């Protein structure tokens, strides 16, 4: 297809078939080649030290995650980040009712909010126990990343001065969340362990636990 | 005192999907050089090799029904078998039932035949050129 755009003529169809055939040979070698490079140890853009989990957070039952984390780290996490897929669409409801509190006891949470979901984010992180303390802002056009806090952060674990509340797009016209965010988290916690929910394959940085339906 | 590299390894084994990480624990990079949804697993590949024995080279549809519960890509099947026999075009083997042991030998012969005429690329012998 589309039906409309194809030739209905015998001569058009014959030449199209001829050109499709050459093209298939062309892309065949590209596939075989690609597939071979992969076999002989090619390396992905993913950093070595990240924990990708492909799951659905509605279905996901966090307890295994919690148990596994306690088991290997002895602490729950220090920073949680979320770019919810607002109504690919989850109703306000099932995002809201996630049992996030189990996930962390003492640290920071970062949540992305389009202007429509901005207020909703406030009272959903308050529900999870957090106190609103900050907002980063991204210019490209603006979107807010709302920051909240729970527990004691008076440990040496979290460093008090924050590099910026403004963040800037890596590249013109960009729609993936900027990288500088990961660095700022690095400021707040250096070499702590962090969890991301609703993660994408580009969202993976080593030392991070990332969970998402597309990872 | 936390060793992250070990940390990632442990976490992955207990939480990650089997395609994502090795029993080793280390990160399976091949999974991320492919689009999500389209990963070809090692249990997929034996399924295919089984299907050549039972149904024959041409019949991708019958294979898809029996071995993949209908969920494979028929084109991917065709392409994967080209690799299995080491030739670029397999119309020659169409209809044939081949043995997992025979397929290696067929492919070995085809690479043999291949390397020599100098039509050999990326481990496939290009009987068809253009």
């Amino acid at each position: 297809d589309y039906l409309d755009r194809l030739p209905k003529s015998k001569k058009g169809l014959q030449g199209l078939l001829q050109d499709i055939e050459k093209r298939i040979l062309h892309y065949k070698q590209l596939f075989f080649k690609e597939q071979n490079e992969i076999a002989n140890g090619k390396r992905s853009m993913v950093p070595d030290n990240s924990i990708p989990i492909c799951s659905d957070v509605t279905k996901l039952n966090f307890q295994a995650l919690i148990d596994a984390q306690m088991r290997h780290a002895g602490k729950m996490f220090d920073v949680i980040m979320m770019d919810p897929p607002w109504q690919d669409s989850l109703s306000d409801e099932k995002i809201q009712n996630m049992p996030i509190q189990s996930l962390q006891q003492d640290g920071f949470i970062f949540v992305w909010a389009i202007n429509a979901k901005y207020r909703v984010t406030i009272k959903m992180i308050e529900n999870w126990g957090y106190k609103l303390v900050d907002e980063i802002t991204w210019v490209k056009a603006k979107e807010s990343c709302l920051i909240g806090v729970k527990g004691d952060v008076d440990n040496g674990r979290f460093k008090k001065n924050i590099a910026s509340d403004v963040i800037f797009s890596e590249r013109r016209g960009q729609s993936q969340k900027p990288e500088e965010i990961y660095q700022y988290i690095n400021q707040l916690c250096p070499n702590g362990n962090y969890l991301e929910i609703f993660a994408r394959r580009n969202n993976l940085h080593d030392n991070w636990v990332s969970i998402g339906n597309e990872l | 005192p936390l060793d992250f590299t070990q940390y990632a390894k442990n976490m992955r084994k207990d939480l990650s999907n089997q395609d994502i990480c090795l029993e080793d624990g280390a990160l399976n990079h091949s999974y991320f050089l492919t689009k999500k949804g389209q990963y070809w697993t090692p249990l997929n590949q034996k399924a295919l090799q089984r299907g050549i024995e039972l149904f024959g080279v041409g019949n991708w549809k019958e294979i898809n029904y029996d071995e993949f519960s209908g969920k494979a890509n028929i084109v991917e099947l065709e392409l994967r078998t080209c690799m299995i026999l080491g030739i670029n075009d397999i119309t020659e083997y169409y209809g044939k039932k081949i043995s997992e042991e025979e397929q290696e030998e067929i492919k070995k012969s085809n690479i043999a035949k291949g390397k020599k005429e100098n039509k050999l690329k990326d481990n496939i012998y290009q009987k068809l050129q253009q």
Binding site: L17, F31 | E76
Partner: peptide
Amino acid sequence: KFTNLEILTHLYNLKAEIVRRLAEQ
């Protein structure tokens, strides 16, 4: 962007439709 396998799937699907229009003819 399309991957090599997606392109080949489109090409194969196309070919069928053609071959079938050459059939119908």
